[PDB]
Write the structure tokens for this entry.
Amino acid sequence: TQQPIVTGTSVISMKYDNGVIIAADNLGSYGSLLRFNGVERLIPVGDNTVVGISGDISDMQHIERLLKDLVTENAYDNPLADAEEALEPSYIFEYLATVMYQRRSKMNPLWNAIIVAGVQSNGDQFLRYVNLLGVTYSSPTLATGFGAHMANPLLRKVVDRESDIPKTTVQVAEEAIVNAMRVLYYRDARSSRNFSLAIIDKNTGLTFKKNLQVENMKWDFAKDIKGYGTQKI
Amino acid sequence: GTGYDLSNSVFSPDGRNFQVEYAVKAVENGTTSIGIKCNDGVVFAVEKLITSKLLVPQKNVKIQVVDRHIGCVYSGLIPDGRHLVNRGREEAASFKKLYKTPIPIPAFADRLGQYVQAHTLYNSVRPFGVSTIFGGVDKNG
């Protein structure tokens, strides 16, 4: 048993017709101190998988090293390590899920919430969640922390059920993700303006975008707000 | 007298360890393998005796990788080679876990050396029936 010290906030994701999108900001908070601004919380694994991690950053870095070891170990005595016997998103996840549940069962959790986004070899979209309790679930949209409360509602307006997936494009999906990151910057006190976004597409592969910023913000109405009830000037 | 070549850790009267010398015979009996150091890397090659048409070509791979930057090849008892490489991989992971950097080849060479030497120290184990050729690239060449 422990307590999280350096923390990452929301990770948000959704699937679209040809793949999956996943995003997370670049902040490592220390309580209410916005301590570290160059923290990458999206971990790519090979060319078909991105793991997004929120929660304790010391644990995130430990999980990061586990994933690098998985790639190394998979390539041992494996002539098809970059072909048929390369790591699938489903393998990455099931491994992580196993670890998360064993650690919670030892009363010593990895204090995180994890979203594994990717595309399987057959072309299928992979999107699944796991957290410090070892709880797992899949949904057309997934998000951690504040993203669950604020991003899912917006993302679910685009993909409300399974049948909305083939109708949704990369452009529409990405715009919806980017809008949600702006909303989280408005209302989450542990969020940063700077974020990373990753697209995994069954045709165009892994597209990793760094150093994105929330743009097109509405603030001008604030000038007209004075007082808290009766004050006029 | 005689009988000095029956146990592993035993010195003969001329200071030799006959069980290690007998292990060399197992290597000399094996397939030929080589290594070539070039001016920014290393190359490994091995002969794979095709016993029959039934052996699937290009499968049965003999050269093994350690970490992401080291290659190992060996001649003699193939299982002993695998055992050695498994140890090497455990050993390289440990080094990386603690020191972050990938294991330098000299450091890695001694890790295999100390392990193989350990199997000449006791009569409850037998020496390795392989000579292993290995290497790669690190911080300084």
